[PDB]
């Protein structure tokens, strides 16, 4: 028990996860004017194989689209990294309002929702398990969602939610390339942070997309419609899962433009 409500939410997490009060916590607010242009940065290059898509699962606090990672069939290369990271998942972050659900913030501004595309260093570690705790183990792309116009590339994801209504339900989810969800240009901010929920490892190199993608209120309504309870129990909706921002504490956020 760790959640997003008062008794076990983000303000309490530290009682248990002392690393909550670390020096590399995420999300952070991004101050555009204090960011630092690094000419060593490369374009990120994604290469997913839609055939790696596996399942979609309800984890109570969120939902997950999991990927087969026994190969280098779906990888991320470029940006800051000199080796390649293997794709293992995507998931979203939202809030109880359609207007305030992002984790990362830009210049004090909170977006409606956030997608995270997570990878691990296959070059260096043997599994996600090993990798998960090391300084350079994970890399996540974060895409800011802005409420507006319906985003039709999210349809295959929403139809799938029907089958994963309550906690612990899984379903097959295949032939899906997540790179369909990224913005048009892939310019980014990067900083050293961590997972945005327990275990809160500071094992993540973030990549925030300069560009946002859309979603409508009703799409968003859908996420918030899943349940956190097991089937047969009283309904408890998946209202929100976003962490407030954390002091930057000496960290530098670099830009690829
Ligand atoms: Zn996330």
From Swiss-Prot:
Function text: Catalyzes the reversible hydration of carbon dioxide. Can hydrate cyanamide to urea.
Region Disordered, residue ranges: 1-27, 237-257
Molecular function in Gene Ontology: arylesterase activity; carbonate dehydratase activity; cyanamide hydratase activity; hydro-lyase activity; zinc ion binding
Binding site for substrate: 196-197
First-level EC class: lyase
EC number of this enzyme: 4.2.1.1, 4.2.1.69
InterPro entries, alphabetized: CA_dom (IPR001148), CA_dom_sf (IPR036398), Carbonic_anhydrase_a-class (IPR023561), Carbonic_anhydrase_a-class_CS (IPR018338)
This protein's name: Carbonic anhydrase 1
Main location class: cytoplasm
